[PDB]
Amino acid sequence: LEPTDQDLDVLLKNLGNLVTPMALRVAATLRLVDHLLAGADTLAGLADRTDTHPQALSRLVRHLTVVGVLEGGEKGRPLRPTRLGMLLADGHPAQQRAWLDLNGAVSHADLAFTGLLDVVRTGRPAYAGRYGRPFWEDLSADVALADSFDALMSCDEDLAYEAPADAYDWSAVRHVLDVGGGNGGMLAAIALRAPHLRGTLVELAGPAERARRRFADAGLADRVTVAEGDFFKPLPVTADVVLLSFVLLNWSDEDALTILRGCVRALEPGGRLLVLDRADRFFSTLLDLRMLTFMGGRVRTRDEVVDLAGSAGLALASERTSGSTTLPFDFSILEFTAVS
Numbered sequence: 001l002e003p004t005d006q007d008l009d010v011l012l013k014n015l016g017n018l019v020t021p022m023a024l025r026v027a028a029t030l031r032l033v034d035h036l037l038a039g040a041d042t043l044a045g046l047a048d049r050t051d052t053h054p055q056a057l058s059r060l061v062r063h064l065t066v067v068g069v070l071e072g073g074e075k076g077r078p079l080r081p082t083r084l085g086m087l088l089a090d091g092h093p094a095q096q097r098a099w100l101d102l103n104g105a106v107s108h109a110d111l112a113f114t115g116l117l118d119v120v121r122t123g124r125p126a127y128a129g130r131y132g133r134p135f136w137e138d139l140s141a142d143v144a145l146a147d148s149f150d151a152l153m154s155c156d157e158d159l160a161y162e163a164p165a166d167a168y169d170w171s172a173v174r175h176v177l178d179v180g181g182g183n184g185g186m187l188a189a190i191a192l193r194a195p196h197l198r199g200t201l202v203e204l205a206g207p208a209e210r211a212r213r214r215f216a217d218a219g220l221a222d223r224v225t226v227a228e229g230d231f232f233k234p235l236p237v238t239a240d241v242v243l244l245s246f247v248l249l250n251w252s253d254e255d256a257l258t259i260l261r262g263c264v265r266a267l268e269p270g271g272r273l274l275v276l277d278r279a280d281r282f283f284s285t286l287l288d289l290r291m292l293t294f295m296g297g298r299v300r301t302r303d304e305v306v307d308l309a310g311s312a313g314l315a316l317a318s319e320r321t322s323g324s325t326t327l328p329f330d331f332s333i334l335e336f337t338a339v340s
């Protein structure tokens with residue numbers, strides 16, 4: 001085993017290359033590709049429509065040219081995107097211009113990776129060290145960050161919760177406590193399936209406001225209420241159902257437990273807690289480190305949740321996973337009761 005010359009090329013140009021991904025983000029953020037397709041082609045022209053330094057922009061563009069994002073501007077051809085560079089046009093269905101946009105939650109959070117040494121040393125996320133507050137607290141205070149994070153998640157689409165709402169039986173359920181319920185998708189899909197069931201949703205100010213709007217829109221304001229609150233604090237009410245929909249994954253093993261201990265605390269006896277959650281190899285570890293770095297969470301396998309649950313006074317009553325046509329992953333509902 002002796003590293004070849006091609007091996008070094010791959011480390012410098014890709015695996016260890018921090019300069020290029022940052023160049024790609026600045027290019028998407030200044031809407032460079034869009035500005036080129038709309039008739040901009042001179043360099044001085046492009047710098048004007050981006051409020052950038054002409055010379056510094058020239059140098060970013062030289063590097064983007066070299067990596068095959070742009071082409072032209074010989075020095076006397078017209079500047080334009082490559083086949084590859086059309087991925088950064090606003091309308092392209094893969095939405096990479098938005099994924100890379102530094103005004104957006106994910107790229108903003110991607111910057112926190114400069115503190116990855118400490119994330120590995122302590123196992124704590126780096127987001128707070130960079131921006132002053134933890135991921136979800138920052139999103140809640142900043143509507144631009146919240147809406148751009150949601151725009152990129154498939155749980156945001158109009159019928160993302162239909163399949164998992166069909167999975168379970170809400171005809172006997174009286175009251176759902178939706179802990180960190182976001183902007184209300186699951187609970188609205190439940191309330192609609194079960195006309196007599198009451199809802200209570202607990203969220204930070206940001207999603208709280210948005211969920212009130214969803215519940216008014218759907219005609220559920222009368223029986224579904226929204227409550228600002230910290231789910232690390234004792235929960236506002238009790239219920240015969242307590243739902244954690246895509247919450248546990250946002251948190252370490254330890255924080256997941258203290259959230260769960262708060263939920264068991266709010267669970268009315270005889271009641272159930274449900275946990276809705278859940279090339280090839282690469283995209284899953286990429287998402288794994290993003291989860292770790294942004295908010296100290298992780299995707300837990302079925303067994304790994306059962307033991308955090310059991311470690312807080314909960315026994316598995318049942319499970320079910322299943323495909324959804326609108327979801328690009330399989331969802332999982334874990335039903336728990338109190339052992340005690």
Ligand SMILES: Nc1ncnc2c1ncn2[C@@H]1O[C@H](C[C@@H](N)CC[C@H](N)C(=O)O)[C@@H](O)[C@H]1O
Nearest residue numbers: 136180181182203204207229230231245246247
């Ligand atoms: N300390 C906290 N207290 C209460 N809610 C929080 C806290 N930290 C994060 N959250 C919220 O929990 C949510 C987690 C999200 N993955 C949304 C889950 C949502 N239940 C869904 O159906 O997708 C965010 O919307 C946050 O606003």
